[PDB]
Amino acid sequence: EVEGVFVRATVERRCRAGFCFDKEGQGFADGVLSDEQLEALESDPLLKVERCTFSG
Amino acid sequence: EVEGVFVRATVERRCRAGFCFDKEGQGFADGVLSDEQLEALESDPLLKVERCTFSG
Amino acid sequence: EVEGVFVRATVERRCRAGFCFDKEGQGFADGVLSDEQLEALESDPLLKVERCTFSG
Amino acid sequence: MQEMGRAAGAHPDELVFALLKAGNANLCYDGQNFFDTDHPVYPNVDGTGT
Amino acid sequence: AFAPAADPGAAWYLLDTSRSLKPLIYQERMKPSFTSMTKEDDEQV
């Protein structure tokens, strides 16, 4: 099981091309790959964040 | 009337077809009918709740 | 810029056609115009408030 | 004994300097060599040596 | 018409004056309060 999910329509910093804008991607508290890119992508939320059990 | 919907921002337990998912915001708080099943319906308001009457 | 939006997917009180509703997230905090009507439109965030400036 | 003491005092010098000489051979916390051109420290990959 | 800048320092007014409104304060959430840490996963902001 993976612990870590953000499902409150919450905002996170995801960078597409030359800018970082609101979007929900990985949104997990565990990492095995893309750690250096995840840091920029996984900036903790701006707004209310609540976690669930995807169990994927 | 519906004294409380107990829906906004919260998701409760909904046991259907043998799998108890969490969605559809079926929260309620009254003694009208299916009072015993009210425990099962409200068995997992995992997320923060925010009541708002529908005046039903 | 925009001082604040206070949307959280909820307006304070958007009253039209003689009926007062709660939706469309039209919360502002500024004295640009319609401050007297801004008191009526605002001043009732029933649900939580999330401020995310649009930098408009 | 004075020679022994002087050598012991000088030991950190050669220790550190040999370590630095082994900069390319050895590595850093990040894992790659202490002096490489492809340090994956941050998404904007940079090279601390050419 | 990068952009440098030449500034004097003899006059007791210096360019780009700062206003320290309040001294730095470290706020915390050790108190038994807040939602994003109780309702939502612990955050101990």
What does this entry list as its resolution, in Å? Answer: 8.0
- Per the DSSP assignment, residues forming a β-bridge with A22 are A13
* C–D touching, 3+ CB–CB pairs within 8 Å: no
- For B:1-56, CB contacts with C below 8 A are 8-9, 50, 52
Q: Tell me the nearest-neighbour CA distance from B48 into chain E, angstroms.
A: 6
Q: Judge: A49–E35 Cβ closer than 8 Å, yes or no.
A: no
Which helix (H) or strand (E) segment is A14 a member of? strand A13-15
Residue type, B40: A
Considering only CB atoms, which chain E residues are within 8 Å of A29? 41
Nearest Cα of chain B lies from the Cα of E39 at a distance, in angstroms, of 6
D26 with D17: CB under 8 angstroms? no
Neighboring chain B residues of E35 at a CB cutoff of 8 Å: 48
Residue D33: strand, helix, or coil: strand
Residue B16: in which H helix or E strand, if any? strand B14-16
Q: How far is residue C46's CA from residue B39's CA, in Å, rounded to a whole number?
A: 27
Instruction: Determine the distance in angstroms separating the CA of A1 from the nearest CA of chain D, rounded to an integer.
Output: 28
Tokens of E45: 């902001």
Distance from CA of B10 to the nearest CA of C (A): 13
Cα distances from A27 to residues A8, A17, E37, in angstroms, run 11, 19, 17
d(CA C4, CA C28): 6
Q: How many CB atoms lie within 10 A of CB E19?
A: 4
- Answer whether B40's CB lies under 8 Å from B1's CB: no
Q: Cα separation of D37 and B21, whole Å?
A: 51
HSE on the CB side for A4, CA within 13 Å?
Answer: 12
Task: Determine the 3-state secondary structure of E36 from DSSP.
Answer: helix
Tell me if E37 sits within 8 A of E44, measured CB to CB.
yes
Q: Please report residues of A whose CB lies closer than 8 A to that of E39.
A: 50
Chains D and B touch (3+ CB pairs under 8 A): no
Task: Quote the strand ranges of D1-50, DSSP E.
Answer: none
Could you tell me which residues are beta bridge partners of residue B20?
B15
Q: What ranges in C1-56 are assigned the alpha helix state H?
A: 35-41
Give E12-21 contacts, CB < 8 A, sequence gap 24+.
none
Angle at E14 between CA E12 and CA E18, to 5 degrees: 115
The Cβ of residue D26 has, within 10 Å, a number of other Cβ atoms equal to 12
CB distance A47 to A7 below 8 Å? no
Range list of H helices, chain B: 35-41
Per the listing, tokens 């046991």 go with: B15
Chain E positions touching A10 (Cβ under 8 A) are: none
- Number of B–C residue contacts, CB under 8 Å: 7
